[PDB]
With several copies, the nearest count.
Chain A
Amino acid sequence: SSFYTVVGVFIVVSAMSVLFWIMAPKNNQAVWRSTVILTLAMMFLMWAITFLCQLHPLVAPRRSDLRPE
């Protein structure tokens, strides 16, 4: 059904977030460590909602006028 595309990109983003948890600089530790891991999650979730419900659509476009070329 290619829901596994969403699953695989989720695996990649979660893996790089766990990679960033053990990488973030020691100066403002919680600020980097929280801002980056919480922006990767939301930028993923919005795209994953976008790719779904365009996968198996129930409504098709119409466009009545549409020049024949």
Chain B
Amino acid sequence: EKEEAIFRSAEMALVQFYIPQEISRDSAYTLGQLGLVQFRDLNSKVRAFQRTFVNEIRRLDNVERQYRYFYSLLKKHDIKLYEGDTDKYLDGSGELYVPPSGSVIDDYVRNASYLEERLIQMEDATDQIEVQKNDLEQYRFIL
């Protein structure tokens, strides 16, 4: 029994959540797997760097930035991205997947941070060769 809400809007409620800290990270996944809560901003008039959970944004978008550097490096040396088609073990019926817990996120962070400088020096090594391919080849045209 759900109202149709095509003649008018749907009737709303404002619900206050009392979430403990030790299950907060875990509970926000369940709140996100059901897509029917719009959160309002309670921390207004607080600056963007003064808020809580800012280093947990800086680490994660550093990982985002290194993934962007990787995908920029994939377009050169043409390799198709795999795009794993199963967008259904996160979506779909059940509405319940277990989120990866802590050590998996730390593995992602240190894996990307180890992988970046390795790819940087491997790319810098193969571009000192091209800049001395170029002058030798055009000198061969001169000769």
For the residues of A in contact with B, the DSSP-based class is helix
Interface residue total, chain A, C-beta cutoff 8 A: 5
Q: Could you list 7 further interchain pairs (A-B, Cβ under 8 angstroms) beyond the known A29-B4, A30-B7?
A: A28-B4, A28-B6, A30-B4, A30-B6, A31-B4, A31-B6, A34-B7
State the total of A-B contacts with C-beta under 8 angstroms: 9
> 9 A–B contact pairs at CB < 8 A?
A28-B4, A28-B6, A29-B4, A30-B4, A30-B6, A30-B7, A31-B4, A31-B6, A34-B7
Nearest neighbor of A31 in chain B, beta-carbon distance: B6
For the residues of B in contact with A, the DSSP-based class is loop
Interface residue total, chain B, C-beta cutoff 8 A: 3
B interface residues with partner A (beta carbon < 8 Å) = 4, 6-7
